[PDB]
């Protein structure tokens with residue numbers, strides 16, 4: 001049967017082609033994950049259908065109702081057979097779904113509007129003129145919520161109680177907030193996304209400091225899935241052949257605008 | 259039952275303490291992996307015994323007998339229950355043993371004396387005045403042997419027929435060869451080790467250029483191991499607590515002598 005792939009509209013991973021209205025099925029999309037999905041499918045030997053997650057979220061469990069949302073939820077409840085997106089491998093998720101070895105290594109980072117007098121997470125924590133937040137319903141927000149590290153705990157204490165909210169629904173919203181903040185808002189997002197945006201016009205943002213942590217993205221399948229083993233081996237084969245590095249160069253720098 | 263842990267003497271992962279002669283069992287050793295093993299055994303609640311792999315190798319398969327050597331072999335043939343060391347996650351290994359999600363991210367790098375006229379892998383493949391090689395029976399040598407990239411392929415053709423042999427049995431021998439070669443020898447090793455040595459006196463070596471690839475080290479268990487699942491979650495939990503970063507700081511720079 002055709003494999004249902006859940007993914008998310010997050011540039012440069014998955015995007016609508018300029019003339020998608022003229023196209024059909026998988027041909028409507030382009031991007032790093034679109035390219036990766038085609039390769040994984042070929043090496044594993046399956047036909048697939050790309051679908052954008054309904055609620056546009058990555059995946060988090062709701063305490064009380066205990067219902068998983070986002071791409072994780074589509075896998076948990078059987079709405080999708082595999083997730084190919086910039087989905088962070090975390091303990092809570094690994095407890096309900098399977099992840100292949102990582103296809104991309106990254107870490108949480110700081111995005112500022114050029115000129116902002118901030119160079120580290122410690123800098124953000126010791127001041128208050130500049131506000132900062134993260135994406136909502138994701139691994140980045142969870143990192144700070146659960147952190148027992150002094151600096152990060154101090155950062156979370158502030159963010160969770162900040163008003164108006166410093167959190168955003170999508171990466172694009174966070175980037176826009178930084179650009180129009182006149183330097184009064186710094187955004188906390190994963191390094192890969194930070195690096196991508198720094199190469200996009202109007203070239204007014206920049207990544208500062210070292211990553212706050214280290215983790216990776218993995219292809220996810222429902223627990224006990226028949227595709228798990230093959231997909232994992234495919235990811236390892238493709239990394240060792242250099243495809244993964246080739247794809248990042250293609251979507252990040254080959255198309256750099258700065 | 260006490261869990262048999264196979265490991266390898268490789269600074270700063272596993273080393274004999276200064277006063278090892280008056281110590282017994284696991285107390286004779288110290289290092290990053292020694293600390294990691296203790297952490298894992300505590301969260302999974304099991305007793306263990308650290309053992310140094312008999313042949314001192316990481317793990318490669320004999321093309322003729324098809325027999326696995328090193329730590330991988332000890333797991334494959336049931337001589338050990340788990341391997342906790344800087345063992346690289348690779349396709350060929352993943353096919354015969356299980357790996358937890360990575361506990362450390364790294365890549366192949368270039369080590370030069372200091373003052374050596376080399377700044378990249380390309381530079382090495384352009385001349386013949388400077389010899390270069392890699393460790394044996396490992397993931398690094400296999401990287402060059404199978405590479406399809408023009409530069410890495412040009413390098414392997416040289417290393418495969420080089421006379422004398424540019425390959426070493428241990429990282430220690432490679433480093434020693436760079437130091438006593440007047441800069442006429444360059445060593446190819448994983449970034450983690452490179453960075454560690456660069457901070458060790460006589461402080462006469464340095465890492466140059468970016469990593470050639472991106473991979474990770476993982477805790478290995480035989481296939482069908484009752485410890486596999488739990489250990490994998492243990493690694494994720496530890497990374498999220500910051501323990502893994504804490505440990506690298508401790509053994510890499512806190513003890514730095516440059």
Ligand SMILES: [Zn+2]
Pocket residue numbers: 039042043
């Ligand atoms: Zn392919």
Ligand SMILES: [Zn+2]
Pocket residue numbers: 297300301
């Ligand atoms: Zn602990």
Ligand SMILES: [Zn+2]
Pocket residue numbers: 320321322323
């Ligand atoms: Zn043989």
